[PDB]
Amino acid sequence: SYAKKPHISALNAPQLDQRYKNEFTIGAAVEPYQLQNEKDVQMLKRHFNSIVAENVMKPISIQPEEGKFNFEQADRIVKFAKANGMDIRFHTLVWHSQVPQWFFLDKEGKPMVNETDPVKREQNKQLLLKRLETHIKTIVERYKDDIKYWDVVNEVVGDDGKLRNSPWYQIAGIDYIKVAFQAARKYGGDNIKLYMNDYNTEVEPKRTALYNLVKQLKEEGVPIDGIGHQSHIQIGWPSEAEIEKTINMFAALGLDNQITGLDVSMYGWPPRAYPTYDAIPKQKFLDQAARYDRLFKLYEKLSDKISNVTFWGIADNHTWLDSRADVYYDANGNVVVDPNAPYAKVEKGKGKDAPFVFGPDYKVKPAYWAIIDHK
Ligand SMILES: O[C@@H]1[C@@H](O)[C@H](O[C@@H]2CO[C@@H](O[C@@H]3CO[C@@H](O[C@@H]4CO[C@@H](O[C@@H]5CO[C@@H](O[C@@H]6CO[C@H](F)[C@H](O)[C@H]6O)[C@H](O)[C@H]5O)[C@H](O)[C@H]4O)[C@H](O)[C@H]3O)[C@H](O)[C@H]2O)OC[C@H]1O
Ligand SMILES: [Cl-]
Ligand SMILES: [Cl-]
Ligand SMILES: [Zn+2]
Ligand SMILES: [Zn+2]
Ligand SMILES: [Zn+2]
Ligand SMILES: [Zn+2]
Ligand SMILES: [Zn+2]
Ligand SMILES: [Zn+2]
């Protein structure tokens, strides 16, 4: 965990996946352009044995208009993974975000959610569910021999512990979830593994709502193999005790657990970010390293219940958390990072987070030494 350990290039550092290879795979979320970047390619080859698409396998990326399938970008990630012996996760077959609006239009082009006639509403449910099945069918028929792990549905439970009231749910009810898993199993066969993915899986009432939902679906024969824990977490939240309780709870149902989008933000919520990487104080990296130390000790403790830990990026020079890195300024134009201190204006998404164990110059951080060691 030491800060005495040097800030060496990650391309010269002990391989992260090999450190954990008997405990769980180590994955990274990627964009196709990173496969054209020499340093990113070297990082993926050196440290990772699992891969996921950050964006190009989402519904709107794959079928942006009905009947128009763009597999070109996804294919490049699959090809790279196969050439390098990496597991692949598919993110994601169903989601209320980055989803093409044509799914939810009726035969006359009007939003299905507005329909008041119950017979027309039922017709729209069957149309939506058929479109859903065709989307999944086309994708799974192409990739079933190459992609082992599938985020079949993403974020289907609300933070209020109710089912998320997305158009999927408004139009089709709970059946859209059942149909999605049944279609994946039907066209993909018994060897692909099917996951329900979500964030804040550690937090009540969402955690028990997710638990009750998967328990009921499995009792009804819906094929669900595991839970994907996005794990978009902070230095001091959620607690390791609550993470452990979450993983055990779902393992008790016979479910695999995967950590699918891990990042450890430097900030709280809503974040008050530093404007640049250079401005983040050294102590934050030490606090982060201690958190990573405890976190991966717990993952190892629970390794018989976790098959994969995937980071939502490669190195600190690229992370979706920067889109959340709001910079607060006081009246004198000085940066404000104290979560309830006075401020005058905010520059949304203009700051810099630092969530990984590899820095933006591809050199290892204190968090790397904290999880590569055996203490
Ligand atoms: O390129 C981009 C892609 O990378 C991107 O991918 C998507 C990113 O992730 C997934 O979608 C995201 C997941 O994260 C959700 O945000 C959640 C919202 O809830 C917050 O929870 C609060 C946290 O703070 C707690 O308070 C604590 C209490 O304890 C201590 F006192 C702390 O000091 C406090 O801070 C609150 O109690 C919590 O409620 C989470 O922090 C926050 O992370 C997003 O809403 C969701 O959209 C997708 O799967 C993935 O595809 O997609 C976009 C593309 O451009
Ligand atoms: Cl991003
Ligand atoms: Cl640096
Ligand atoms: Zn390797
Ligand atoms: Zn996913
Ligand atoms: Zn700089
Ligand atoms: Zn990105
Ligand atoms: Zn550096
Ligand atoms: Zn350690």
Task: Give me the domains of the chain, ranges plus CATH numbers.
Answer: 10-321+353-372 (3.20.20.80)
User: Which structure tokens are listed for 241?
Assistant: 């005790």
Count helices and strands in the chain by DSSP H and E runs: 11, 12
- Does residue 240 come out as left (phi exceeding 0), alpha (psi in the -120 to 50 range) or beta? alpha
- What residues sit around ligand 4, an ion, with C-beta below 5 angstroms? 17, 49
DSSP characters for 146-204?
A: T--EEEEEES-B-TTSSBP--HHHHHHTTHHHHHHHHHHHHHH-SSSEEEEEES-TTST
User: Which structure tokens are listed for 355?
Assistant: 């969530």
Distance from the alpha carbon of residue 355 to the mean position of ligand 1, in angstroms: 13
Distance from the alpha carbon of residue 15 to the mean position of ligand 4, in angstroms: 7
Closest ligand 1 atom to Cα of 151: 49
Q: Are 148 and 86 in contact (CB under 8 A)?
A: no
- Nearest C-alpha to atom 53 of ligand 1 is from which residue? 320
Q: To test the ligand 1 pocket, which listed residue (199, 239, 319) has its Cβ within 8 A of the most ligand atoms?
A: 199
Count of residues in the chain: 375
From the list 366, 364, 239, the residue with the least C-alpha distance to 314 is: 364
From the list 135, 110, 56, 131, the residue with the least C-alpha distance to 88 is: 56
Closest ligand 1 atom to Cα of 323: 55
Overall resolution, Å: 1.9
**Pocket lining: 42 vs ligand 1, CB cutoff 6 Å:** no
**Pocket lining: 2 vs ligand 1, CB cutoff 6 Å:** no
Closest ligand to C-alpha of residue 54 is 1
Interhelix angle 206-219/240-251, rounded to 10 degrees, is: 10
Distance from the alpha carbon of residue 356 to the mean position of ligand 8, in angstroms: 13
**Pocket lining: 135 vs ligand 1, CB cutoff 6 Å:** no
Closest ligand to C-alpha of residue 7 is 8
C-alpha R_g of the chain: 21
Beta strands in the chain (DSSP E): 25-30, 50-53, 87-91, 149-154, 193-198, 226-229, 232-233, 256-264, 306-311, 327-329, 335-336, 345-347
- Nearest C-alpha to atom 50 of ligand 1 is from which residue? 54
Which backbone phi and psi does 345 adopt, to 5 degrees?
-145, 160
Helix then strand then coil, in percent of the chain rounded to 5, is: 40, 20, 40
Distance from the alpha carbon of residue 273 to the mean position of ligand 6, in angstroms: 14
User: Which structure tokens are listed for 123?
Assistant: 């017709």
Q: How was this structure determined?
A: X-ray
